[PDB]
Design a protein around this nucleic acid. Structure first.
Ligand code: MG
Ligand code: MG
Ligand code: MG
Ligand code: MG
Ligand code: MG
Ligand code: MG
Ligand code: MG
Ligand code: MG
Ligand code: MG
Ligand code: MG
Ligand code: MG
Ligand code: MG
Ligand code: MG
Ligand code: MG
Ligand code: MG
Ligand code: MG
Ligand code: MG
Ligand code: MG
Ligand code: MG
Ligand code: MG
Ligand code: MG
Ligand code: MG
Ligand code: MG
Ligand code: MG
Ligand code: MG
Ligand code: MG
Ligand code: MG
Ligand code: MG
Ligand code: MG
Ligand code: MG
Ligand code: MG
Ligand code: MG
Ligand code: MG
Ligand code: MG
Ligand code: MG
Ligand code: MG
Ligand code: MG
Ligand code: MG
Ligand code: MG
Ligand code: MG
Ligand code: MG
Ligand code: MG
Ligand code: MG
Ligand code: MG
Ligand code: MG
Ligand code: MG
Ligand code: MG
Ligand code: MG
Ligand code: MG
Ligand code: MG
Ligand code: MG
Ligand code: MG
Ligand code: MG
Ligand code: MG
Ligand code: MG
Ligand code: MG
Ligand code: MG
Ligand code: MG
Ligand code: MG
Ligand code: MG
Ligand code: MG
Ligand code: MG
Ligand code: MG
Ligand code: MG
Ligand code: MG
Ligand code: MG
Ligand code: MG
Ligand code: MG
Ligand code: MG
Ligand code: MG
Ligand code: MG
Ligand code: MG
Ligand code: MG
Ligand code: MG
Ligand code: ZN
Lengths: 16, 37, 174, 204, 140
RNA sequence: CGCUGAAAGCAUCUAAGCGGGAAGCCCGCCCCAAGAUGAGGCCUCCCACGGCAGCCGGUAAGGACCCGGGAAGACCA
RNA sequence: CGAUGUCGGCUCGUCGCAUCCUGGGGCUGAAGAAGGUCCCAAGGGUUGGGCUGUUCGCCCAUUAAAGCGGCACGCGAGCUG
């Protein structure tokens, strides 16, 4: 059942 | 068999019996046969 | 109003010997062991067995009656014996004796054969009448019930195996 | 509860009543009894059978003594059959007649480290529509925090085969005593050349 | 003055006829004997109780409806792997387990309690193989 | 669903006792399994070796190493 | 909130039982066959397709049946997107 998404779609980690 | 929390006599021919920890009702009329549950 | 206190006539010549927790009962037709509560006293009088109870608590009153009857039945069994008659009803329906065994033709695609257990005797006087006989009342009534169960009375037709003296109660169809 | 040891030799089919009959041929006889197990001595009943003759040069001393006590020439394999006490000192294919039904035990062919699709007939992943390096992978192995672990017994990749397998209720198609041959209809575990046990069947 | 500590003692073997005794009320006593708490030099960190032989375990007794309703339980670790076996059946199959299981639960958990339990020797039926030990019969 | 049967003179499958009764339960089938430390059993083999429930050394029955391989196998086994 | 990735699908299960089927049963306004209704039962089973991102639902063709729920609306360090 569709509800609010609570995170944005994640991107792979930017290099540290 | 009727199974229900309220078991009662239905006709005067109806007999309340306790049998193996349970309340049944027996009648010569099969419709009236009940066990409590 | 009371069974336990009522005494048991013991005919000549059946014997009754009491042991702690049993009474043995012998007669012309054989013997029977009656297991009996340690708590009742079974008392042997002239031509009379009686049972007495230790108090008037419900359990004792309950064991009392049971006990008299249990012995009284044993007594009758070794003297007169016990029997039950079964009638067969319905067109195809028949009984015949195959040696010591009871063969039943009652509408199945096969006949049903009942072997007598020890102490039980089967007799077919006519072919729609069966007689179960023995000295043990429970055993008799039981084997009787077994045979009847092979084909209970139908609810719509005088058809099936019946106890003698069992009323035919049918209901309508359409 | 008769039984015998044998080697699987291979399959063919025979023609019987205008029918092709798939068969496995087993060399079974002759099996010298080399110890009897009894209730008084051993606590249960069975026969230790031997099979295939061995080079005495290869039989160490504790083994030789065992054979000696039976007056039995040395043999490559010893295996018991349970609840079987034959009259003779020797068991041969003759204990079976065509038409009887048997169970055969073999050691199955060994597949080594096997994937989930070969081992457990798992479905695998898609081959396109975006499947990323998961074409033969098992999928999920669990739930989340409850229960937070994997069931004992969960089907996973691992070794598969080279195990004891018993195929049951096989028809005996022929027996050829002059060559110690038992022809059983169907398939028997293991490779050609592998050891098998042929027992009377427990099916009815 | 420091409290007395016993040097190692020779343990005493004891024999108990379980027949007709009430399972639980026998088990507590067996436990005491195994801990060694009948002994005035009781020391809690050494095994210094008796070895206990019990016979006729199959003839243990139980009150109420427990033969039918008391359920022993075993978990295998596998899905659906909780086996429930009732007293009746346990007596009919491994009768000595009934006493064994009851005494075990009345011993301490830990390395010592486990060791104490090995000192219990329970037999169904009137005989036992510990003749060499000449176990002293105890009424309890 | 019964048999027998009181309390409760009748009746009652129940209070004593006995029966029938499910693809379900226990056994039975197939596989693992004595690290089952509660470490089971049987058959066979070796032997009561030297120097000083311990150590050092040479052996026994046996085992490993190495090698040729294997419908066994990732190495290992 | 110095991060417990969020629908659906796939994969892989596992459990509950208020049972969809299969087994046992009582009552039936149960003649039979077929139903209804309640009780016991969770061992196993519980199909393929059109539409739509759908879950759901409707529909086609079958079926003994085409069960309902829980497992972070089970499962993105397993995939999809
Ligand atoms: Mg990042
Ligand atoms: Mg009402
Ligand atoms: Mg009224
Ligand atoms: Mg009545
Ligand atoms: Mg007299
Ligand atoms: Mg008096
Ligand atoms: Mg043994
Ligand atoms: Mg093998
Ligand atoms: Mg391989
Ligand atoms: Mg795979
Ligand atoms: Mg496979
Ligand atoms: Mg495949
Ligand atoms: Mg697939
Ligand atoms: Mg594929
Ligand atoms: Mg796809
Ligand atoms: Mg991608
Ligand atoms: Mg790819
Ligand atoms: Mg998650
Ligand atoms: Mg957990
Ligand atoms: Mg392997
Ligand atoms: Mg032929
Ligand atoms: Mg091959
Ligand atoms: Mg004491
Ligand atoms: Mg303390
Ligand atoms: Mg045992
Ligand atoms: Mg404890
Ligand atoms: Mg603690
Ligand atoms: Mg009646
Ligand atoms: Mg009666
Ligand atoms: Mg009255
Ligand atoms: Mg009773
Ligand atoms: Mg019963
Ligand atoms: Mg019956
Ligand atoms: Mg079946
Ligand atoms: Mg094995
Ligand atoms: Mg071992
Ligand atoms: Mg083993
Ligand atoms: Mg343990
Ligand atoms: Mg061993
Ligand atoms: Mg090598
Ligand atoms: Mg190699
Ligand atoms: Mg947050
Ligand atoms: Mg953090
Ligand atoms: Mg973080
Ligand atoms: Mg996380
Ligand atoms: Mg589910
Ligand atoms: Mg239910
Ligand atoms: Mg049904
Ligand atoms: Mg009908
Ligand atoms: Mg109608
Ligand atoms: Mg009609
Ligand atoms: Mg119905
Ligand atoms: Mg009902
Ligand atoms: Mg189920
Ligand atoms: Mg299940
Ligand atoms: Mg289900
Ligand atoms: Mg299209
Ligand atoms: Mg679609
Ligand atoms: Mg849809
Ligand atoms: Mg919709
Ligand atoms: Mg149907
Ligand atoms: Mg569908
Ligand atoms: Mg989710
Ligand atoms: Mg919620
Ligand atoms: Mg779900
Ligand atoms: Mg998810
Ligand atoms: Mg992802
Ligand atoms: Mg997802
Ligand atoms: Mg995850
Ligand atoms: Mg993750
Ligand atoms: Mg993950
Ligand atoms: Mg994670
Ligand atoms: Mg994956
Ligand atoms: Mg998008
Ligand atoms: Zn009525």
């Amino acid at each position: 059942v569709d509800k609010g998404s609570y995170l944005p779609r994640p991107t792979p980690p930017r290099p540290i | 068999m009727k199974v229900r929390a309220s078991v009662k006599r239905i006709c005067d021919k109806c007999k309340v019996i306790r049998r193996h920890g349970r309340v049944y009702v027996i009648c010569e009329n099969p419709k009236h046969k009940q066990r409590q549950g | 109003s009371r069974i336990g206190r009522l005494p048991i006539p013991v005919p000549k010549g059946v014997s009754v010997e009491v042991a702690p927790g049993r009474v043995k009962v012998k007669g012309p037709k054989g013997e029977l062991e009656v297991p009996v509560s340690p708590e009742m006293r079974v008392v042997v009088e002239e031509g009379v067995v009686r049972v007495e109870r230790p108090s008037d608590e419900r359990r004792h009153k309950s064991l009392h009656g049971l006990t008299r009857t249990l012995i009284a039945n044993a007594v009758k069994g070794v003297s007169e014996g016990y029997s039950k008659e079964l009638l067969i009803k319905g067109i195809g329906y028949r009984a015949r004796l195959v040696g010591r065994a009871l063969e039943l033709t009652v509408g199945f695609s096969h006949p049903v054969v009942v072997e007598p257990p020890e102490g039980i005797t089967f007799e077919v006087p006519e072919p729609t009448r069966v007689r179960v006989s023995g000295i043990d009342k429970q055993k008799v009534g039981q084997v009787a019930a077994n045979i009847r169960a092979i084909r209970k009375p139908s609810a719509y037709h005088e058809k099936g195996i019946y106890y003698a003296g069992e009323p035919v109660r049918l209901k309508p169809g359409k | 509860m008769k039984g015998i040891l044998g080697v699987k030799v291979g399959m063919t089919r025979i023609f019987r009543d205008d029918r092709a009959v798939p068969v496995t041929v087993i060399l079974a006889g002759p099996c010298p009894v080399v110890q009897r197990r009894t209730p008084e001595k051993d606590g249960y009943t069975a026969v230790q059978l031997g099979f295939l003759p061995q080079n005495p040069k290869r039989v160490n001393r504790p083994l030789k003594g065992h054979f000696a006590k039976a007056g039995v020439e040395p043999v490559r394999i010893l295996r018991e059959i349970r609840d079987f006490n034959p009259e003779g000192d020797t068991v041969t294919v003759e204990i079976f007649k065509p038409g009887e039904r048997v169970d055969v035990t073999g050691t199955s062919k060994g597949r080594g480290f096997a994937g989930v699709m070969k081992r457990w007939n798992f479905a695998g992943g898609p081959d396109s529509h975006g499947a990323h390096k998961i074409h033969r992978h098992p999928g999920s192995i669990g739930n989340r925090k409850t229960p937070g672990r994997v069931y004992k017994g969960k089907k996973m990749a691992g070794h598969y085969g080279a195990e004891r397998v018993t195929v049951m209720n096989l028809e005996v198609v022929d027996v050829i005593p002059e060559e110690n041959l038992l022809l059983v209809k169907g398939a028997v575990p293991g490779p050609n050349g592998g050891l098998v046990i042929v027992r009377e069947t427990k099916k009815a | 003055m420091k409290t007395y500590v016993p040097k190692q003692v020779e343990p005493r073997w004891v024999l108990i006829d379980a027949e007709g005794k009430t399972l639980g009320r026998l088990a507590t006593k067996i436990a005491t004997l195994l801990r060694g708490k009948h002994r005035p030099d009781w020391t809690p960190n050494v095994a210094m109780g008796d070895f206990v032989v019990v016979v006729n375990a199959d003839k243990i007794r139980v009150t109420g409806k427990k033969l039918e309703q008391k359920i022993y339980t075993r978990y295998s670790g596998y899905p659906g792997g909780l086996k429930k076996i009732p007293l009746e059946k346990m007596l009919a199959t491994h009768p000595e387990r009934v006493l064994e299981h009851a005494v075990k639960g009345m011993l301490p958990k830990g390395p010592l309690g486990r060791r104490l339990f090995k000192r219990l020797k329970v037999y169904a039926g009137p005989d036992h193989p510990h003749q060499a030990q000449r176990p002293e019969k105890l009424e309890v």
